[PDB]
Design a protein around this nucleic acid. Structure first.
Ligand code: DZ4
Ligand code: MG
Ligand code: MG
Ligand code: NA
Ligand code: NA
Length: 327
DNA sequence: CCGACATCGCATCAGC
DNA sequence: GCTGATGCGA
DNA sequence: GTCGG
């Protein structure tokens, strides 16, 4: 449905969502507000009353009232007030820095630190993730065009095969679904010598090579199975340098790779749909495995999976190209 | 009336 | 020192 | 905040 159809309402609900997470520390009210924002933004009619919207799953009494006040006054008093609030609005803002959550932001604002400049003055009070978050605050809220993503995929698949040609890597996320832009790069990785019933060196060697050719520039976190960091395309000729980008690389056992690929390909709402279909079918799907329920409710052993399609077959669903997995 | 609401790897903190 | 908890991003 | 056992 069109943007400014009920855009005024969904912006209201998303604002309310973020204050719940970042200021009130009420994570379930956060998800609640977003569930309503989502179900309304897909509703193909301009909403006339709070009662009209209350018919949608996720829209209860309190949001129905808020919609009324909005439709009648063009604003929400509680939201207007909380926007005015110097403490609460500063807390909400600081959480836009990756590494700073609802709790850290609460602390900074307590001891007087409210803005980016305040963060820049106080580097010694920040940890490694947060410094990188501050350093790339602007870049991180930018989107990545598919053309850049393709160029990034080139570098990654190249350097990975160059380390060891038996590696298997797949760029998942929205990129794999064909999207015209992406928020980050989600890379999945496996090797024929790494399974469930089974070398930690496998992930480290890939990160290292990518740092060598200077594709990876910073590191947020890194273990034996998951890498979170920053990456940048090399800049061409004398043209303006590319934004720094968020990139994830995680090493998955060969056994669990395609449950991994399928899950991390998304979309979000496709996953929950395909998890519940799926449920009436007597199977249970997580990111690792698919297991059979289970005549009382016991899970049997993990079932063998050697492609995405296998998992589609178990639950008797027609395989669907990542292109169509928007839900 | 009252609990569930997605889930997990990693960094750092709190406590011993 | 170690172990578990907590915060964080996704 | 919403839904439902
Ligand atoms: N809450 C959730 N429930 C089910 N799957 C989820 C999930 N959160 C993440 N995933 C799975 C499904 C997601 O598709 C996949 C990648 O996570 P992202 O990179 O955070 N989201 P995407 O890459 O699609 O879009 P973009 O990055 O351009 O903003 O991880
Ligand atoms: Mg992504
Ligand atoms: Mg991601
Ligand atoms: Na409802
Ligand atoms: Na943040």
């Amino acid at each position: 449905p069109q943007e400014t159809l009920n855009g005024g309402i969904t912006d209201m609900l998303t604002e309310l969502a973020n204050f719940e997470k970042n200021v009130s520390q009420a994570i379930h009210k956060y998800n609640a507000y977003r569930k309503a924002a989502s179900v309304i933004a897909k509703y193909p009619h301009k909403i006339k009353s709070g009662a009209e919207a209350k018919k949608l799953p996720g829209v209860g009494t309190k949001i129905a009232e808020k919609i009324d006040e909005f439709l009648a006054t063009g604003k929400l008093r509680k939201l207007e007030k909380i926007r005015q609030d110097d403490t609460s609005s500063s807390i909400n803002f600081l959480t836009r820095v990756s590494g700073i959550g609802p709790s850290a932001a609460r602390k900074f604002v307590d001891e007087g630190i409210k803005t980016l400049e305040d963060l820049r003055k106080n580097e010694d009070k920040l940890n490694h993730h947060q410094r990188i978050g501050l350093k790339y605050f602007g870049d991180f809220e930018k989107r990545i065009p598919r053309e850049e993503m393709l160029q990034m995929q080139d570098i990654v698949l190249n350097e990975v095969k160059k380390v060891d040609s038996e590696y298997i890597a797949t760029v998942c996320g929205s990129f794999r679904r064909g999207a015209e832009s992406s928020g980050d790069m989600d890379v999945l990785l496996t090797h024929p010598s790494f399974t469930s019933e089974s070398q930690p060196k496998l992930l480290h060697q890939v990160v290292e090579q990518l740092q060598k050719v200077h594709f990876i520039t910073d590191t947020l976190s890194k273990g034996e199975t998951k890498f979170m960091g920053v990456c940048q395309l090399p800049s061409k000729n004398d043209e303006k340098e590319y934004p720094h980008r968020r990139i994830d690389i995680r090493l998955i056992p060969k056994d669990q790779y395609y449950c991994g690929v399928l899950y991390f390909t998304g979309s979000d709402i496709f996953n929950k749909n395909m998890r519940a279909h799926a449920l009436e079918k007597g199977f249970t799907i997580n990111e690792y495995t698919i297991r059979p329920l289970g005549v009382t409710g016991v899970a049997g052993e993990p079932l063998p999976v050697d492609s995405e399609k296998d998992i589609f077959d178990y639950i008797q669903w027609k395989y669907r190209e990542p292109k169509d997995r928007s839900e």
